[PDB]
Amino acid sequence: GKPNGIRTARKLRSRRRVQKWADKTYKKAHLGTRWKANPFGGSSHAKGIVVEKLGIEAKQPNSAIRKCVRVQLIKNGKKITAFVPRDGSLNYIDENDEVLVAGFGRSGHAVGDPGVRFKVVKVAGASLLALFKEK
Template identity: 40%
Template structure:
């Protein structure tokens, strides 16, 4: 058993010496796939508001926004948390999004394909705007 472990360790060390293998590893990591490029949050421009139907066995409509990330130009769909949040977001607003922390970096619960969550609108917390504690700045 110890000999096999030693051989596997040596093989891994040899692979890491090769540039091509290391580049392939980097591509497969989260930073290579993730639209946020490994960062916890990102700013995005709202393109449109949508409603998405939940997966079985749940029913109901979920409010989401289609956004374009400012730093990479990629388009992602972000979930609007709680009731009434969609009233405070308009097209062309700058929002801050973060991951919804689903299993293995994927979607959470019955929301199909939505991996991100809106937390700020024009630099102010969406929750504070929704509760009426702060007003949304006009840009």
């Protein structure tokens, strides 16, 4: 078991700082690789230009073509695929049009039906909800 005795501060204190790294979520915080990894800069949102309009298919069981966009972040010019929320709206994007990118809400990882971690919040600053609504 543990060492209980009054003078065992080092062994107790050393064991935590070593075996904190066994957590998956602790490493994603506290390593230096967070800053190089992600296309985002430890940031909530990021603008970019739509290099291409793209279509991808959801993994079974679900089948369909999901309509996403490939974008280059302005700061790093790093390509990413951002899903476009709601019906249609693909027409709205226009190649070479600036689009806001937001996290899919899963802290990267993946969402539901492959390998996409971002969602386009706004197009030309208009935003997706306003147009789908038409308000």
